Design an enzyme around this catalytic site. Structure first.
Site, short mmCIF file in Angstrom:
data_model
loop_
_atom_site.label_atom_id
_atom_site.label_comp_id
_atom_site.label_asym_id
_atom_site.label_seq_id
_atom_site.Cartn_x
_atom_site.Cartn_y
_atom_site.Cartn_z
N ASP A 351 3.30 6.78 0.34
CA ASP A 351 1.88 6.65 0.57
C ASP A 351 1.25 7.41 -0.57
O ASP A 351 1.79 8.42 -1.02
CB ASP A 351 1.47 7.30 1.89
CG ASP A 351 1.73 6.40 3.07
OD1 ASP A 351 1.09 5.31 3.11
OD2 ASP A 351 2.55 6.79 3.94
N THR A 353 -2.58 8.75 -1.41
CA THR A 353 -3.45 9.91 -1.21
C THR A 353 -2.88 11.21 -0.67
O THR A 353 -3.10 12.27 -1.25
CB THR A 353 -4.70 9.58 -0.37
OG1 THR A 353 -4.53 10.12 0.94
CG2 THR A 353 -4.96 8.07 -0.31
N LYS A 515 -24.92 4.13 1.32
CA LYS A 515 -23.84 4.31 0.36
C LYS A 515 -22.66 3.44 0.82
O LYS A 515 -22.53 3.13 2.00
CB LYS A 515 -23.39 5.76 0.33
CG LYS A 515 -22.56 6.12 1.52
CD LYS A 515 -22.15 7.58 1.54
CE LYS A 515 -21.53 7.89 2.90
NZ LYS A 515 -20.92 9.24 3.02
N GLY A 626 -4.75 2.54 -0.17
CA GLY A 626 -5.82 1.84 0.50
C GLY A 626 -6.86 1.45 -0.53
O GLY A 626 -7.93 0.97 -0.19
N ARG A 678 -3.82 -2.95 -0.11
CA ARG A 678 -4.38 -2.66 1.20
C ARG A 678 -3.56 -3.18 2.36
O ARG A 678 -3.88 -4.17 3.00
CB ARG A 678 -5.82 -3.17 1.24
CG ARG A 678 -6.74 -2.32 0.36
CD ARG A 678 -8.16 -2.80 0.33
NE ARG A 678 -9.04 -1.80 -0.28
CZ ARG A 678 -10.32 -2.00 -0.60
NH1 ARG A 678 -10.89 -3.17 -0.37
NH2 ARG A 678 -11.03 -1.02 -1.14
N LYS A 684 4.64 -2.17 6.34
CA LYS A 684 5.68 -1.21 6.01
C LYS A 684 7.02 -1.62 6.62
O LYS A 684 8.08 -1.47 6.01
CB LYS A 684 5.31 0.18 6.50
CG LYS A 684 4.19 0.84 5.72
CD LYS A 684 4.07 2.32 6.07
CE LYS A 684 3.11 3.04 5.12
NZ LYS A 684 2.96 4.48 5.48
N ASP A 703 2.79 8.97 8.75
CA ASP A 703 2.67 10.08 9.69
C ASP A 703 2.10 9.77 11.06
O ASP A 703 2.01 10.67 11.90
CB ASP A 703 1.86 11.21 9.08
CG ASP A 703 0.39 10.90 9.03
OD1 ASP A 703 0.01 9.99 8.27
OD2 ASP A 703 -0.38 11.56 9.75
N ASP A 707 3.22 4.34 11.97
CA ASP A 707 4.33 4.22 11.04
C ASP A 707 5.70 4.55 11.61
O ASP A 707 6.71 4.41 10.91
CB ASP A 707 4.09 5.08 9.79
CG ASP A 707 2.84 4.68 9.01
OD1 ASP A 707 2.46 3.48 9.03
OD2 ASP A 707 2.25 5.57 8.37
N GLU A 908 48.92 23.57 -2.73
CA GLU A 908 47.55 23.25 -2.34
C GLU A 908 46.54 24.13 -3.06
O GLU A 908 45.49 23.65 -3.49
CB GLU A 908 47.39 23.36 -0.82
CG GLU A 908 47.99 22.18 -0.09
CD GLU A 908 47.73 20.86 -0.80
OE1 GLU A 908 46.55 20.58 -1.14
OE2 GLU A 908 48.69 20.10 -1.03
N1 LIG Z 1 -18.51 7.65 4.23
C1 LIG Z 1 -18.66 6.45 3.60
N2 LIG Z 1 -19.75 5.66 3.95
C2 LIG Z 1 -19.95 4.45 3.35
N3 LIG Z 1 -19.12 3.95 2.39
C3 LIG Z 1 -18.04 4.74 2.05
C4 LIG Z 1 -17.73 6.02 2.58
N4 LIG Z 1 -16.63 6.53 2.06
C5 LIG Z 1 -16.28 5.58 1.19
N5 LIG Z 1 -17.08 4.48 1.13
C6 LIG Z 1 -17.02 3.19 0.28
O1 LIG Z 1 -16.61 2.15 1.16
C7 LIG Z 1 -15.44 1.56 0.64
C8 LIG Z 1 -14.33 1.66 1.72
O2 LIG Z 1 -14.27 2.69 2.74
P1 LIG Z 1 -12.91 2.73 3.57
O3 LIG Z 1 -13.26 3.66 4.71
O4 LIG Z 1 -12.22 1.47 3.99
O5 LIG Z 1 -12.01 3.51 2.51
P2 LIG Z 1 -10.66 4.43 2.38
O6 LIG Z 1 -10.26 4.20 0.96
O7 LIG Z 1 -11.15 5.80 2.56
C9 LIG Z 1 -9.35 3.98 3.22
P3 LIG Z 1 -7.97 4.99 3.02
O8 LIG Z 1 -8.48 6.14 3.89
O9 LIG Z 1 -6.74 4.34 3.55
O10 LIG Z 1 -7.75 5.40 1.58
C10 LIG Z 1 -14.89 2.47 -0.37
O11 LIG Z 1 -14.08 1.78 -1.29
C11 LIG Z 1 -16.13 3.20 -0.92
O12 LIG Z 1 -16.64 2.52 -2.05
#
Ligand SMILES: Nc1ncnc2c1ncn2[C@@H]1O[C@H](COP(=O)(O)OP(=O)(O)CP(=O)(O)O)[C@@H](O)[C@H]1O
Ligand SMILES: C/C=C(/C)C(=O)O[C@H]1C(C)=C2[C@H]([C@@H]1OC(=O)CCCCCCC)[C@@](C)(OC(C)=O)C[C@H](OC(=O)CCC)[C@@]1(O)[C@H]2OC(=O)[C@@]1(C)O
Ligand SMILES: [Mg+2]
Ligand code: NA
Length: 994
Positions: A351, A353, A515, A626, A678, A684, A703, A707, A908
């Site tokens: 994984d 991150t 955002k 992801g 993704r 997996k 974890d 999984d 031996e």
């Molecule tokens: N708190 C939030 N609110 C709104 N958009 C967010 C955000 N955190 C990230 N994003 C945006 O939304 C898109 C996806 O969020 P999502 O929650 O699926 O991501 P993630 O990459 O954190 C999954 P993973 O945790 O497996 O890495 C991101 O690619 C980013 O551009």
């Protein structure tokens, strides 16, 4: 038990024919209970000690030993009393040995732990329902909850089953679904249906999963499924359905015994033939009964002679040490046998991150629209410093520090980053470090805020415990956060509705700050903001925006990008249904782009290098993240999985892509892919299947219970030190530090442990080969017993044990990680190595027999028939006046036996030295390369003299030797071995393999 997430609240009630206000009727309960059974997971299967021991005695060798022990025990009662006395030692020892192992398997397994047993730590003992036989809620045992009855849950309650939510009583319902994933971030739940019937749990926003906890709120629901049919329940099934193969060493070992057995019986056959004359010459005589005892008591000699009794202990003592060893390197190994298979890992799926990166976010680049005029467009890129969430760093334009305030677009970008965020910072005193409160990517956005305090408010005159949320707090006082439309993977974004603080910023009043992933938000923008003014979004400005977005995430920066915007005139409050998520994307439209932000989740320092060693090691590495594939690939290149200019099209796949493929190409992609973007729920476990079809030893990480099935199926499931308890219990290894690098290091100790392990095995096994030849000849000739089970035993457990476990400390080769992973099918002994021990063994067999016989012939301490008549020693007390003419019991003399033994012992301690290296002469690989190997030899030798010089031991294990003639004899017999081997070893120069 329906798939409720896609059905309406009314649909589910109708399905089970239940009343939300009344609940199931006693009949309905009775019926339902019978149809669907009780709400629990099947009981555990920890078979009894009787069933244990029985298995501890199911091994073909442990059996052969048992039989042998019996024969000896039976023989130990066949002769006149007093003088024999010790003949209860042979059977008693064997049994101990066996018994001891049985004592191991019992304490061994008894302290283990099923990953399935761990799941039951998720079943709440009680639940709360509404049934027709009462009005107030009933608190019953979860076990008795059934599909269809109304359930009620609230803060702190552990969800008792898979519940479809009917109505949320509190103002918001939040759930901690970590035990599934691991993310502690609570999730908001709703009530309206989720269309897609094939939706992944993460998107079943109206569902409550048995096992999860209620973070905030109170809600009412109707049970959709229970027991084994529940989500965690399906998983338990997968984990039980999965069967795990034996360690290749355990495989090779069982094989050894399967063959060790045939040879033994074969020998018996042959012996019987070598003495087939006893059919045409023995005239019915009295002594024709003391001959069967010979064959029987020689059979037990043959048995203890063929089995490496001490091997089991050497191996575990080795692995246990290697275990405690790997521990210091942060690699917690569970299950000793895994150490080997770890050493052979062909592929490692990791994984991203948590382990490949640090999961420590920080914004490195911002950019706001500077100018839009005609086709002419101008941005306003920036840069920021500071990797920690620590409010320490500066914003720069062309590397030149700047005052964020001098820019309008920024003050906004800043307000948004601060308002449309559910995270915060916190400074601790214990370790004086600034720690992330909410989510990593958000807690970062706040850090971005402090470092660019737009207003220039005085903070340096403030303590740290406030410096954290100083500029963030100020912004929270210029706008009122009415409510927030939470994030959802459909619209990939989030907003917050806000109103100003009367007379302070009520110019336009109500605003909406959103955002999220760039693509979505940008499409939903009809205007771009240039400072304080706004302009209609246009083709060019959009293109420019995106381009820089792809650069930042695709380029070497490998940054996560959050587009930022606001809705200038949001819909009126009364026109918004804040409780049903589908309308959120609609509420977040006609937006005005105010700038994007880029952040980085920095690869771990040691990763770049570790990825390299794997290349040297021929161990493929696969990233599972992801990230959108584009960024997935970029990151893969940044760390070395891919080459900056390497073609990847066929080597990287997104979960969706992988699905659209047919089982065929789906398997292909796996043997070649190194990146999965993704990944959905089951990927997996599938990827692990394919990698297995190509006979690859694969390592997965993960974890959550999500999984566990994959971690169980992988040859080496790898859990995080910070991960769930179920994941850990499902994996063979745990990374105390969650560091990918720890995996690799582990693979290494693996390869090293085994190499040494491989030699001491060869060492012992070969000796056993020779011990047997002795017993064969001793019988083929008819000669008196040259060696006795008891002696042999001591040898194989002690005298040869110690040097064996010392070889365990042989120094590691230097190219261990430059050679491809060892093939599991690679045998321990074959070809020319077979031939060598084929000889050595034959040698010790003649050397041992001859030595003892010598004492009988040509010795100055009890001579005998130099005409080889000794062969008929059986016939002595019979025709005493035949050719005897002396004491008819010298054949039971101790010296001749302590002879053949001291010659074995030495041969031996000698062959042990020949094992330090498979092919390198001792003049190249001197013995002092392993001080332990020498120290042990000393310990065995003095131990040998202990059974000669002591007084009680002598009775059981004969009388001592004369040191100048008797012993020197021993040496001129054994010492030559080293030569014989060095000779066969040197044969490595006449061949082409070095
Ligand atoms: N708190 C939030 N609110 C709104 N958009 C967010 C955000 N955190 C990230 N994003 C945006 O939304 C898109 C996806 O969020 P999502 O929650 O699926 O991501 P993630 O990459 O954190 C999954 P993973 O945790 O497996 O890495 C991101 O690619 C980013 O551009
Ligand atoms: C241990 C003691 C003995 C006496 C034995 O019978 O071992 C055989 C045997 C079963 C094997 C052989 C032994 O073969 C002989 O020694 C020839 C028989 C002649 C002796 C009788 C005198 C008339 C091993 C010991 O030795 C050599 C050098 O030939 C090497 C190896 O074993 C290993 O790699 C050990 C695995 C832990 C195995 O060929 C193995 O067969 C397999 O399947 C393996 C792959 O296991
Ligand atoms: Mg996220
Ligand atoms: Na496993």
């Amino acid at each position: 038990m329906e798939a409720a997430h896609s059905k309406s609240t009314e649909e589910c009630l109708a399905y089970f024919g239940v009343s939300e206000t009344t609940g199931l009727t006693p009949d309905q309960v009775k019926r339902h209970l019978e149809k669907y059974g009780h709400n629990e997971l099947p009981a555990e299967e920890g078979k009894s000690l009787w069933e244990l021991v029985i298995e501890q005695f199911e091994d073909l060798l442990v059996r052969i030993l048992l039989l042998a022990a019996c024969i000896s025990f039976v023989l130990a009662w066949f002769e006149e009393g007093e003088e024999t006395i010790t003949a209860f030692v042979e059977p008693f020892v064997i049994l101990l040995i066996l018994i001891a192992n049985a004592i191991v398997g019992v304490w061994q397994e008894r302290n283990a732990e099923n990953a399935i047993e761990a799941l039951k730590e998720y079943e709440p003992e009680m639940g709360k329902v509404y049934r027709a036989d009462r009005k107030s809620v009933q608190r019953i045992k979860a076990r008795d909850i059934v599909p269809g009855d109304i359930v009620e849950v609230a803060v702190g309650d552990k969800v008792p089953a898979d519940i479809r939510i009917l109505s949320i009583k509190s103002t918001t319902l939040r759930v901690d679904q970590s035990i599934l994933t691991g993310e502690s971030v609570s999730v908001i739940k709703h009530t309206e249906p989720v269309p897609d019937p094939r939706a992944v749990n993460q998107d079943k926003k109206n569902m409550l999963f048995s096992g999860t906890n209620i973070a905030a709120g109170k809600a009412l629901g109707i049970v959709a499924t229970t027991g084994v049919s529940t989500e965690i329940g399906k998983i338990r099934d997968q984990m039980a359905a999965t069967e795990q193969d034996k360690t290749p060493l355990q495989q090779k070992l069982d094989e050894f015994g399967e063959q060790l057995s045939k040879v033994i019986s074969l020998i018996c056959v042959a012996v019987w033939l070598i003495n087939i004359g006893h059919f045409n010459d023995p005239v019915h005589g009295g002594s024709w009964i003391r001959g069967a005892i010979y064959y029987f008591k020689i059979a037990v000699a043959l048995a203890v002679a063929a089995i490496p009794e001490g091997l089991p202990a050497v191996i575990t003592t080795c692995l246990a040490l290697g275990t405690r060893r790997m521990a210091k390197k942060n690699a917690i190994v569970r299950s000793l046998p895994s150490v080997e298979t770890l050493g052979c890992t062909s592929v490692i799926c990791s994984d991203k991150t948590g382990t490949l990166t640090t999961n420590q976010m920080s914004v490195c680049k911002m950019f706001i629209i500077d100018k839009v005029d005609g086709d002419f467009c101008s941005l306003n890129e920036f840069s920021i410093t500071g990797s920690t969430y620590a409010p320490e760093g500066e914003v720069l334009k062309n590397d030149k520090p700047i005052r964020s305030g001098q820019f309008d677009g920024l003050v906004e970008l800043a307000t948004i980053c601060a308002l449309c965020n559910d995270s915060s910072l916190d400074f601790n005193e214990t370790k004086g470090v600034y720690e992330k409160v909410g989510e990593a990517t958000e807690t970062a956005l706040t850090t971005l805020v402090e470092k660019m305090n737009v207003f220039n408010t005085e903070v340096r005159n403030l303590s740290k415990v406030e410096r954290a949320n100083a500029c963030n707090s100020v912004i929270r006082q210029l706008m009122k956060k009415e409510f927030t439309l939470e994030f959802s993977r459909d619209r990939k974004s989030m907003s917050v509705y806000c109103s100003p603080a009367k007379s302070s910023r009520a110019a336009v009043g109500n605003k909406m700050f959103v955002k999220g992933a760039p693509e979505g938000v940008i499409d939903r923008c009809n205007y771009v903001r240039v400072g304080t003014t706004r302009v209609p979004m246009t083709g060019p400005v959009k293109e420019k925006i995106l381009s820089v977005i792809k650069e930042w995430g695709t380029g070497r920066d490998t940054l996560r990008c959050l587009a930022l915007a606001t809705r200038d005139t949001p819909p009126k409050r009364e026109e918004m249904v804040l409780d049903d998520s589908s309308r959120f994307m609609e509420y977040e439209t006609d937006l005005t782009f105010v700038g994007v932000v880029g952040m980085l989740d920095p690869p771990r320092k040691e990763v770049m290098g570790s990825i390299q060693l794997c290349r040297d090691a021929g161990i493929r590495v696969i990233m599972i993240t992801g990230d959108n594939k584009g960024t997935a690939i970029a990151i893969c290149r940044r760390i070395g999985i891919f080459g900056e200019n390497e073609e990847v099209a066929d080597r990287a796949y997104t979960g969706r892509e992988f699905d659209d493929l047919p089982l065929a190409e789906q398997r292909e992609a796996c043997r070649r892919a190194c990146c999965f973007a993704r990944v959905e729920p089951s990927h997996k476990s599938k990827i692990v299947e394919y990698l297995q079809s190509y006979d690859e030893i694969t390592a997965m990480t993960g974890d959550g219970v999500n999984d566990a099935p994959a971690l169980k199926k992988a040859e080496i499931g790898i859990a995080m030190g910070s991960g769930t308890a179920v994941a850990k219990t499902a994996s063979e290894m745990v990374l105390a530090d969650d560091n990918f690098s720890t995996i690799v290091a582990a693979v290494e100790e693996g390869r090293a442990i085994y190499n040494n392990m491989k030699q001491f095995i060869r060492y012992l096994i070969s000796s056993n080969v020779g011990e047997v030849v002795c017993i064969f000849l001793t019988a083929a000739l008819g000669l008196p017993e040259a060696l006795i089970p008891v002696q042999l035993l001591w040898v194989n457990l002690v005298t040869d044990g110690l040097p064996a476990t010392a070889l365990g400390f042989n120094p590691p080769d230097l190219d261990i990680m430059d050679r491809p992973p060892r093939s599991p099918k690679e045998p321990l002994i074959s070809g020319w190595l077979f031939f060598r021990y084929m000889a050595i063994g034959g040698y010790v067999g003649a050397a041992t027999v001859g030595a003892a016989a010598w004492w009988f012939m040509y010795a100055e301490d009890g001579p005998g028939v130099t005409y080889h008549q000794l062969t008929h020693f059986m016939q002595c007390t019979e025709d005493h006046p035949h050719f005897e003419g002396l004491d008819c019991e010298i054949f039971e003399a101790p010296e001749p036996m302590t002879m053949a033994l001291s010659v074995l012992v030495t041969i031996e301690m000698c062959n042990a030295l020949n094992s330090l290296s498979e092919n390198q002469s001792l003049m190249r690989m001197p013995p002092w390369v392993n001080i332990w190997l020498l120290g042990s030899i000393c310990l065995s030798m003095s131990l040998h003299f202990l059974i000669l010089y002591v007084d009680p031991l002598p009775m059981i294990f004969k009388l001592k030797a004369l040191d100048l003639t008797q012993w020197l004899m021993v040496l001129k017999i054994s010492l030559p071995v080293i030569g014989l081997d060095e000779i066969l070893k040197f044969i490595a120069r006449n061949y082409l393999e070095g």
